[PDB]
Amino acid sequence: GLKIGAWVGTQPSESAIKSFQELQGRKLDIVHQFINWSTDFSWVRPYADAVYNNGSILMITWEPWEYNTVDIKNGKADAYITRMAQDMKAYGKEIWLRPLHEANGDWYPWAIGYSSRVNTNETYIAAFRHIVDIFRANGATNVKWVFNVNCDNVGNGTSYLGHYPGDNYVDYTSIDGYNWGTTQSWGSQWQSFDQVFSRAYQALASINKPIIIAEFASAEIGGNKARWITEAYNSIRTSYNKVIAAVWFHENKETDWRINSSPEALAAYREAIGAL
Numbered sequence: 001g002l003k004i005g006a007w008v009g010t011q012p013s014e015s016a017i018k019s020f021q022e023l024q025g026r027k028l029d030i031v032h033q034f035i036n037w038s039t040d041f042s043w044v045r046p047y048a049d050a051v052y053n054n055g056s057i058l059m060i061t062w063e064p065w066e067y068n069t070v071d072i073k074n075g076k077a078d079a080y081i082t083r084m085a086q087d088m089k090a091y092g093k094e095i096w097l098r099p100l101h102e103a104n105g106d107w108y109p110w111a112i113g114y115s116s117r118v119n120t121n122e123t124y125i126a127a128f129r130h131i132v133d134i135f136r137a138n139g140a141t142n143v144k145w146v147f148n149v150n151c152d153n154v155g156n157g158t159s160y161l162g163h164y165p166g167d168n169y170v171d172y173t174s175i176d177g178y179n180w181g182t183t184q185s186w187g188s189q190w191q192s193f194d195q196v197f198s199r200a201y202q203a204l205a206s207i208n209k210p211i212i213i214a215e216f217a218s219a220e221i222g223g224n225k226a227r228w229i230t231e232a233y234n235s236i237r238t239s240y241n242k243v244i245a246a247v248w249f250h251e252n253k254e255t256d257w258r259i260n261s262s263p264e265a266l267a268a269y270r271e272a273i274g275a276l
């Protein structure tokens with residue numbers, strides 16, 4: 001059955017996890033957290049403990065603001081990577097790790113579309129493989145590797161699979177995507193779940209790996225968010241059959257992505273996610 005996850009809008013302390021479970025009226029199967037590449041596992045541990053004590057899987061989006069793909073492929077981050085691998089192995093529990101993500105966008109300093117042009121398919125693949133190699137050399141077989149694409153290719157040189165590091169280095173593929181509604185002054189428009197996700201899914205469906213929707217959410221403005229939610233989960237279950245997990249992005253950020261941005265959105269979300 002479809003696993004239900006969330007980034008709960010703050011680092012997932014015990015109380016933040018429990019509070020979200022009360023909010024959505026259901027167990028979180030996956031708890032999502034973002035960290036950077038100057039964060040030791042000792043900082044992560046208490047969060048990890050809360051997640052596993054709850055009976056959930058921890059997915060960590062591991063964001064190398066501190067190293068780009070050239071730095072990483074050349075081994076400049078290896079001391080930090082090695083420590084993380086050793087500490088995660090020692091921890092021993094199943095952790096889903098999503099390094100270097102949305103690399104077919106242009107907003108991250110490790111992304112192929114990033115305006116400095118420093119990141120290429122080759123440097124990206126070499127970087128990703130290097131990370132995995134180090135984890136494997138340190139026995140961290142408990143760490144599952146999540147490859148990721150943004151729903152849209154944004155920026156020069158971007159593609160869904162040009163930076164794909166190979167089935168030998170990947171446990172899950174994943175897609176991120178947002179219905180921005182009419183909230184953005186550049187000219188965003190309301191998009192249904194299908195309109196957001198269908199292109200990326202077609203590309204990833206050609207890969208023999210299960211798929212996670214690692215980040216998704218909808219604005220309130222420019223359409224009916226409650227109906228969007230109902231239809232999104234229906235779409236996932238009906239036509240996105242390789243998708244095994246749906247992980248909401250619950251934060252009032254660029255717009256109000258929260259499941260409780262309105263009472264009607266919340267009601268729809270509670271019903272949509274199901275018993276399981």
Ligand SMILES: OC[C@H]1CNC[C@@H](O[C@@H]2O[C@H](CO)[C@@H](O)[C@H](O)[C@H]2O)[C@@H]1O
Nearest residue numbers: 007034035063102176178215251253254
């Ligand atoms: O634009 C929509 C989202 C698209 N995906 C990444 C999100 O940013 C991430 O958001 C996280 C939670 O705010 C932060 O901890 C990370 O540093 C940051 O990279 C965006 O808000």
